[PDB]
Amino acid sequence: DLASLAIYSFWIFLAGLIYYLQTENMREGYPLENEDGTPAANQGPFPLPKPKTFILPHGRGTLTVPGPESEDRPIALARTAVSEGFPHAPTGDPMKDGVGPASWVARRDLPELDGHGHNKIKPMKAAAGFHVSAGKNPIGLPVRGCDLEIAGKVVDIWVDIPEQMARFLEVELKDGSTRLLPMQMVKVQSNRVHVNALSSDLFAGIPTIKSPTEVTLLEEDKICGYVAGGLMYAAPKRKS
Amino acid sequence: ALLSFERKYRVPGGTLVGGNLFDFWVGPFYVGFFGVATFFFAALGIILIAWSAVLQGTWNPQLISVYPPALEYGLGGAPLAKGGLWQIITICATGAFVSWALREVEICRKLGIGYHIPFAFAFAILAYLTLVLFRPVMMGAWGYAFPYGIWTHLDWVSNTGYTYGNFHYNPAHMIAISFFFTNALALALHGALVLSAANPEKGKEMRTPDHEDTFFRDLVGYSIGTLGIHRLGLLLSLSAVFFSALCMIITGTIWFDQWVDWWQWWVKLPWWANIPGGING
Amino acid sequence: AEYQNIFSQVQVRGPADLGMTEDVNLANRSGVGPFSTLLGWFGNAQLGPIYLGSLGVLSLFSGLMWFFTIGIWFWYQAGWNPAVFLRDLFFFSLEPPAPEYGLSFAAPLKEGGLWLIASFFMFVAVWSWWGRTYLRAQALGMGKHTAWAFLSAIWLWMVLGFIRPILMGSWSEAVPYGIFSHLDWTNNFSLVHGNLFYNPFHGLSIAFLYGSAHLFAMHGATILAVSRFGGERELEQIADRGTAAERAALFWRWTMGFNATMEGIHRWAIWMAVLVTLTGGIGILLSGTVVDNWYVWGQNHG
Ligand code: 2GO
Ligand code: 2GO
Ligand code: 2GO
Ligand code: 2GO
Ligand SMILES: COC(C)(C)C/C=C/C(C)=C/C=C/C(C)=C/C=C/C(C)=C/C=C\C=C(C)\C=C\C=C(/C)CC/C=C(\C)CCC=C(C)C
Ligand SMILES: CCCCCCCCCCCC[N+](C)(C)[O-]
Ligand SMILES: CCCCCCCCCCCC[N+](C)(C)[O-]
Ligand SMILES: CCCCCCCCCCCC[N+](C)(C)[O-]
Ligand SMILES: [Fe+3]
Numbered sequence: 001d002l003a004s005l006a007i008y009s010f011w012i013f014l015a016g017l018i019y020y021l022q023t024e025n026m027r028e029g030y031p032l033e034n035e036d037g038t039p040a041a042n043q044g045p046f047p048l049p050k051p052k053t054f055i056l057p058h059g060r061g062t063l064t065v066p067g068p069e070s071e072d073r074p075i076a077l078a079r080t081a082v083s084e085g086f087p088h089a090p091t092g093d094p095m096k097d098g099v100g101p102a103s104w105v106a107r108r109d110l111p112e113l114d115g116h117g118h119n120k121i122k123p124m125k126a127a128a129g130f131h132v133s134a135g136k137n138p139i140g141l142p143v144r145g146c147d148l149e150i151a152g153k154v155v156d157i158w159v160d161i162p163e164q165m166a167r168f169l170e171v172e173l174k175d176g177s178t179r180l181l182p183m184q185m186v187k188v189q190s191n192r193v194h195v196n197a198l199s200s201d202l203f204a205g206i207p208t209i210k211s212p213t214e215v216t217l218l219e220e221d222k223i224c225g226y227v228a229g230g231l232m233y234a235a236p237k238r239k240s
Numbered sequence: 241a242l243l244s245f246e247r248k249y250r251v252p253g254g255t256l257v258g259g260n261l262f263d264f265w266v267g268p269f270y271v272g273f274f275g276v277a278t279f280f281f282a283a284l285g286i287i288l289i290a291w292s293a294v295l296q297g298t299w300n301p302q303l304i305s306v307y308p309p310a311l312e313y314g315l316g317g318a319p320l321a322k323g324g325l326w327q328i329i330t331i332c333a334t335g336a337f338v339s340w341a342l343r344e345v346e347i348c349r350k351l352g353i354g355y356h357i358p359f360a361f362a363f364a365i366l367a368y369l370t371l372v373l374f375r376p377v378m379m380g381a382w383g384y385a386f387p388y389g390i391w392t393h394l395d396w397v398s399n400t401g402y403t404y405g406n407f408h409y410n411p412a413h414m415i416a417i418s419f420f421f422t423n424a425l426a427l428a429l430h431g432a433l434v435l436s437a438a439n440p441e442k443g444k445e446m447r448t449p450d451h452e453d454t455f456f457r458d459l460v461g462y463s464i465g466t467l468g469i470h471r472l473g474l475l476l477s478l479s480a481v482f483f484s485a486l487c488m489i490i491t492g493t494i495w496f497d498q499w500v501d502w503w504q505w506w507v508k509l510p511w512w513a514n515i516p517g518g519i520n521g
Numbered sequence: 522a523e524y525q526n527i528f529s530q531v532q533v534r535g536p537a538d539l540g541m542t543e544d545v546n547l548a549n550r551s552g553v554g555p556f557s558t559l560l561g562w563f564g565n566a567q568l569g570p571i572y573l574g575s576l577g578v579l580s581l582f583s584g585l586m587w588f589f590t591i592g593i594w595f596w597y598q599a600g601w602n603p604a605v606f607l608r609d610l611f612f613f614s615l616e617p618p619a620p621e622y623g624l625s626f627a628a629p630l631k632e633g634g635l636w637l638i639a640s641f642f643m644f645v646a647v648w649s650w651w652g653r654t655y656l657r658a659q660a661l662g663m664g665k666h667t668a669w670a671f672l673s674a675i676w677l678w679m680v681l682g683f684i685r686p687i688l689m690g691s692w693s694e695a696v697p698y699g700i701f702s703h704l705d706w707t708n709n710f711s712l713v714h715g716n717l718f719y720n721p722f723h724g725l726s727i728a729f730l731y732g733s734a735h736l737f738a739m740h741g742a743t744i745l746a747v748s749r750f751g752g753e754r755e756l757e758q759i760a761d762r763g764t765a766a767e768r769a770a771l772f773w774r775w776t777m778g779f780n781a782t783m784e785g786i787h788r789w790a791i792w793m794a795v796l797v798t799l800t801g802g803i804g805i806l807l808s809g810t811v812v813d814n815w816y817v818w819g820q821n822h823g
Contacts, residue, residue: 002811004823006803007721017792025785028762029243029770040241054438056760057445063760069244077248085265087252100251101352105764112757115450115541130535133566134558138531159533162450163465164565166531184749187524188531196523221763224750228352232253243774245767270775347775351768354525354746360738394718408704424733424794428670431791436664438759438784444662447541449756451661453565454540458657461554461571466753468564471527474741477734503611512608517600519612 023049027065035084058117060110072106075099095205095226095233102229104221111214114162119214121167123156126213130159141193143171143181146230146238149200152179154193158215168215168223169193171203179206180215185227197230199237241267254349256342270350274343278336285332289388292325305389308372309382323382330372330385337365360474363481370485379492404491405498412487413499419480426476430469526748532561539570545660549574572657576649583646590639591615591698614699615639617692624692639698640682651675666791673795677802688810715814722804723815729797736793740786743769758783 026048032040053064076097077088095102112120124130132139143152151171155178158168168180187194198206207222209215215223242250255263258273265271293304308330309316309323318324344358372385386396401407408414433455437447449466456463464472495502507513507520514521524530537553554568573581595613599606617640618625618633628634655668686695696706710717717723744752750765752758758766759782766783774780781789812818 001823003721003807003818006807010722010725010800010803021785021788021792022779024788025781027785028766028782029245031244032241033244033246035242035247042241054760055443055445057448060760071245071248075248077251080252085267087260087263088247088250090251094251099248100253101249101350103248103764103767105245105762105767107761107763112754115448115454124533127535130533133532133534133556134561135529135531157531157533159535161535162448162453162538163467164533164535164538164567165465165467165529166533182749183530184524184526217757217761217763220751225764228749231352232349243770243780245762246771246774249767249771265775268774268778344772344776347772348746351772353768353772354523354749356525356742356745357739357772360742363738364735398716398718406704406708408708409701420730420734423737424730424797425674427733427737427790428673428794429667430737431787431789431794432666432670434755434787435784435791436658436666437756438787439664439666440662441659441664446756446760447661447663449754450541451543451663452756453538455657455661455663455667457540457570458545458550458572458661459654461551461569462565462567464564466755467526467748470741470744470748470753471563472741473737474527474745477738477741480734506611507608509608512604515602515604515608517602518598518605518609520609521605 019046022046027052029069030066031069035079035088058113060108060113073098095202095229098222098225100229101232102225104218104225107217107221109216109218111216118161120162121158121160121215123170123213124159125156127159127161130161130164132157136188136190138169138186138188138193141188141191143169143186143193143195143203145198145200145203146196146234146240147199147201148239151195151198151200151203173203175204177208178212179203179208180220180223181206182224182227195227196238196240197227197234199230199234199239201237202230202234249351251350254351255346256349270343270347272343272346274339274346277339278343281332281335281339285329285336288325288329288332291320292329295321295325302390305387305392307387307392308376308385311381311383313383314381315377318382326388327382329388334365334369334373337361337368341365356474360478363478367481367485370489375488375492378489384492400491404496405500407499409499409503410487410491411502412483412490416480416483416487419476419483423473423476423480426469426473430473433469526745528562532558532566534561534566538567541661543661545572545657546574549577574653576653576656580646580649580653583642583649587639587642587646590635590642594635611700612702614697614702616697616699616702617686617695620691620693622692623690624687633692636695636697637692640695644683647675647678670791670795673798673802677798677805680802680806685806685808685810688806694809710808714808714812715816715818717804717808717815719815719819720804720808720812722800722807726797726801726804729793729800732793733797736790739773740790743772746772755783755787 023046026046030048032043034040048066051064051066053062055062076091076099078091080086080089090097090099094100098104114120138154139157141154142150143154145151152173153171154169155172156170157166158170158180159165160167166183168182169186170178171181172178181195185195185197206226207219209219252260252263255272262271262273262276269275289306292306293299296305298304306326306329307323308326309318313323317327341358341361344361345355348355376382376384386393433452437452440447453463453465534556550572551570553570556566557568558566560566594615596606598613599609615636617636618628622628622633626637651668651671654671655665658665658667682695686692696703747765747769750763750768752765752769762783770780
C-alpha cells in the first residue's frame, strides 16, 4: 500500500543522503594517514568525492577539495611508543614549536578581506569612526597573567569592521612592542584585563605581526594557537 | 589512522584522572580514565539488557523492554526480573553518560578549546535524570519512570501525558516546544545561509559574511551575526531542554490535576471574571 | 572563572553598515534603523536597513490582512468588549466551514466563509514571502538554499491547511486560527487516526526535531569552544582551514570516532532541520487519505 511504499522509499532516500553527507565531510583531512604520514591501509567504506572548486573573491584564487594534503610545516614531535596510538612528545618547547594545544595551521599569509576588498580587521585607531559603544573600555588597562604579574597595557582594540565587533586587544609589553591577545581569552575587569592562559613571562613569546596595521590569517593562527596552548603548558605558573 | 592534520595535536596532557595511564587512542577514539569508565558502564548495562531480554524471553529489538519496579516497591530495591535490572541499568546509563561528559572535558583540555560542548551535553543528561531519578524520587517510586524499550517508552509518554488530560496545556511544555521549533527553524536558516554564501550561483565567487548580514537585513531587517547565530542555536536548544525537564519535574508534584484547568487562574482574575460575554461567561 | 563568549564584554560601533550591493535595487532598501545595545550583548546591534519592493508590500499587507481578519472575529466573539477579549484571548477561534459545505466557498461569513478569507490572505502572504527569499538571494548572487529549505516548512503548512483538506473532500478537515483551539485540533487529529505515535513519519519527524536540537547544540557549542581561534568565521575556514576547524573536527573524531568539515557540518544541519517538516508533511498527508488508523496499519507492519 501507498504508506508502505512511501516509507520504504524514504529509507532508501535517507541512505543515499547519509552517503552524500558523509562523503561531503571527507573533503578535508582525508585520506587517513599512519603516524608517519603514509596513507593508511583502512580508509573505511566511504570513498572520496569528486572534487569541487570554490572561487575565492579578490583574486585570492581558488580552493579545490578534496586535494593533496600536507601540513606545509615542520612538526616538532616524536613517538613515545613502538606501536600506533600513543601520544607524541614535544621534541622542543611546544609553545614555541607550535604543537599540541599551541598548534597553528599554515593558513594564507594575507589578511581576511571584507566584501569590499578591505582588511576585515583593523586596530580601532585606524578604523573610522569606530569606537567602544557599550561595556568597559579596556584601552589603557594594565594586563595581568595567570602568575598575577602585570605583563603590559592595553593600547588598542583590533576590531572586525564588517561585523562590528572586537577581536583582539593590542597590548604593549615592558619593552615597547605590542602583541595581539584574542578577545576571547581575556577577562576585562573594572581595573585590569586578566589573562588566565598565560603567565606574564610568556607574553614576549607571543608571535608578532609583520605589519603593524594588519594581521594575516597565518599570524592569527600562530597567536591564537600560542595563547590557548598556555592553558596546558603554563600550568606550572598558574596559580588561581 | 589519523586525519592529515591530526598528529601535531596528539600530545600528552589534559587528563583529569590517571595521569598518563590511560592517555592514548584506540583508532580515532581517545580513551582516558573516563573512556574506560564509559566502556565499563555501557558494557555492563548492555549485558544486563541482553539478560532482561532473556528473563522476559525475546531477541526482537521491537519487543525487548526493561520495566522499572512496580509502584508498590516505592523507592526500595526490587528483584532483578521485576525491575532491579532496570534499577542497575539506570545506574549504568548515568555512569556512562557522566563518564562521556568527563571524557569530553579531557579532550577539550588536550585540544586547548572551551568546555562548551560537555556543558551542553549536561543538559540532555539532566533531562534523562529528571525522567528517571528526580521525578520518580519526588513522586515516591521508580515505577513513575519510563521503561527501556523502543515502542514501550512511547506508551509511557502517552499514558503519562493523558493522565493530565491534553498535555499541550502544560505551560512549560508550550515554552519548550517553542524553543524546539525555533531551534529547528534557526538550524535550517543557519545551515542554508552559510551554504548559500559558500556555494553561490554558477561561476560566481564565494560570497562573504557581509553578504550574509546583508541577505537577512534585506529579508527581515535584521541579521544576528556569525557569532550570534551560534550563540543562539546553543541557547534555543539548551532552553528547549531546560523547559522540557522543568515541564515534567512539576507534573505530578506541584501540579497533578488536568493541565487545561490550570489556565483558569487567568480567566478568574477578579477584574474580568464575571464580565458577561466571550467564551467564558 | 574563564570568559565564555555567551555574551560580549565590549561592544564597538562604527558607521551604519548599509550592506553589499551586487545586483540589488538600492532604490528599494530603507535606511538604517536604530542600534540596540541590548541586542549587542548577544548579536548585532544594528537594526535595518530592510528591503521592501512590490512582493515585500504584498506579503506584509496580506499578512496583516490575515492577522486582522482573525482579530476582528475575536473582538466580535468578545462582544466588542476589551476586558473579555483579553480574558478569553486564548479561547477564541476562527473555525473553518462545516463538513456540509465540503470544498465549496458557499458557507456564510460567520460560519466558515471568514476562515477562507484569512486562509486566502495567508496563502498569498506566505507564497509571496517565499518568492522574496529566492529573489533577495538572486539579487545578491547567492545560492537558493534558504528558499529551498523554507519550501520544506511550506510543505507541512500546505499539507495541513490546503492539500489534505482538498484530498479529504472538505475545508473542515483544516486547522482553525486560535491558540487553544489549534492544540485541541492537534490532539484530536491524533485520536481520530489511531495515535500518531504509530505513524512512522511522525516518529521520523520527532527524530529530526530532537536531532535538530541535539545537532545545533553540538555545533553552536563547538563553534563557541573554538571561537578563540576565529571559528565563527566559517566561510573563511572553508576556503582556508585553520586550527579552529581542525580542533573542532578532532574533538568529534576523538569523542565519537568520526567528524565533519566546516562546510559539511552545515549540510548535516540544513538537512536535519528540513527533514523534520518533510517527513512531517508526508505523515500528515497520508493520514486519513490512505491510513484511517496508524495503530492498525502498524499491526500489518504495512
Ligand atoms: C524547515 C522547518 C522549520 C520549521 C521548524 C519551521 C517552523 C515555523 C513555525 C512554527 C514552529 O510553527 C512558525 C510560526 C514559522 C514561521 C516562519 N517561518 Zn518557518 N520553519 C522552518 C524553516 C524555515 C526557513 C528556512 C524559513 C522559514 C521562514 C518562516 C517565516 C515566514 C514569514 C511569513 O510568512 O510572512 C508573511 C506575513 C507577515 C510577515 C505578517 C504576519 C502578521 C504579524 C503577526 C503582525 C505583527 C508584525 C508585523 C510584520 C509588524 C508590522 C508593523 C507595521 C506598522 C509596518 C516565519 C518567521 C522564512 C523566513 O523568512 O525566516 C525568518 C524562511 O526563510 N522557516 N516557522
Ligand atoms: C524525550 C521524551 C521521551 C523520553 C522518555 C525519551 C527518551 C529517550 C532516550 C533516553 C533519555 O535515553 C533515548 C535513548 C531515546 C531514543 C529514542 N526515542 Zn525517545 N523519548 C521520548 C519520547 C519519544 C517520542 C515521542 C519518540 C521517541 C523516539 C525515539 C527514537 C529516536 C530518537 C532520536 O532520533 O533523537 C535525537 C538524537 C539523535 C539523532 C542522536 C542519535 C540517537 C540514536 C538514534 C539513539 C538510539 C538509542 C538506542 C536504540 C538505545 C539502545 C541503547 C544501547 C542498548 C546501545 C529513539 C529510539 C521516536 C520513535 O520513533 O521511537 C519509536 C519517537 O517518535 N522518543 N528516547
Ligand atoms: C541538550 C540538547 C540536546 C538534546 C535535545 C539532545 C537530545 C538527544 C536525544 C533524544 C532527543 O532522545 C538522544 C537519544 C541523544 C543522544 C545523544 N546525544 Zn544528544 N542532545 C542534545 C545535546 C547533546 C550534546 C552537547 C552532546 C550530545 C551527545 C549525545 C550522545 C551521547 C552518547 C553517550 O553519552 O554515550 C555514552 C553511553 C553509551 C555509548 C552507551 C550507554 C548504554 C546504557 C548504559 C544502556 C542504555 C540505557 C538507555 C536509557 C536505554 C534506553 C533506550 C530506549 C529509550 C529506546 C548520543 C548520541 C554527545 C555526543 O557525543 O554526540 C555525538 C554530546 O556531546 N547531545 N541526544
Ligand atoms: C496529542 C498530540 C499528538 C501526540 C501523539 C504527539 C506527540 C508528539 C511529541 C511528544 C510525545 O513529546 C513530540 C516531540 C511530537 C513532535 C511532532 N509532532 Zn506530534 N503528536 C501529536 C499530534 C501531531 C499532529 C496532528 C502533528 C504532529 C506533528 C509533529 C511534528 C511537527 C514538526 C514541526 O516543526 O511543526 C511546526 C512547523 C510548521 C507547522 C510549519 C509552519 C510554517 C509556516 C510556513 C509558517 C507561517 C508563519 C505565519 C504567517 C506566522 C507569522 C509570524 C510572524 C511573527 C513573522 C513534530 C516533530 C506535525 C507533523 O508533522 O505530524 C507528522 C503534525 O501535523 N503531531 N509530537
Ligand atoms: C488587538 O486587536 C487587533 C484587531 C489589533 C489585532 C489582533 C489580532 C489577533 C489577536 C489575532 C490572533 C491571531 C491568531 C491567534 C492566530 C493563530 C493562528 C494559528 C495557531 C495558526 C495555525 C495553523 C494554521 C495553518 C495550518 C494554516 C494553513 C493555511 C493554509 C495552508 C492556506 C490555505 C488557503 C486556503 C484554505 C484558501 C483557499 C483559496 C484560494 C484562492 C487558494
Ligand atoms: C532497550 C532497547 C532495545 C534495543 C535493541 C538493539 C538496538 C539495535 C538497533 C535496532 C535495529 C532494528 N532492526 C533494524 C533490526 O530492525
Ligand atoms: C528567534 C528568537 C525568538 C525567541 C522566542 C523563542 C520562543 C519562546 C516563546 C515563549 C516565550 C517564553 N520566554 C522565552 C519569554 O520565556
Ligand atoms: C540526518 C541523519 C541523522 C540520523 C537521525 C535519524 C535516526 C532514525 C530514528 C528511528 C525512527 C524510527 N521510526 C519508527 C520513526 O521509523
Ligand atoms: Fe556554523
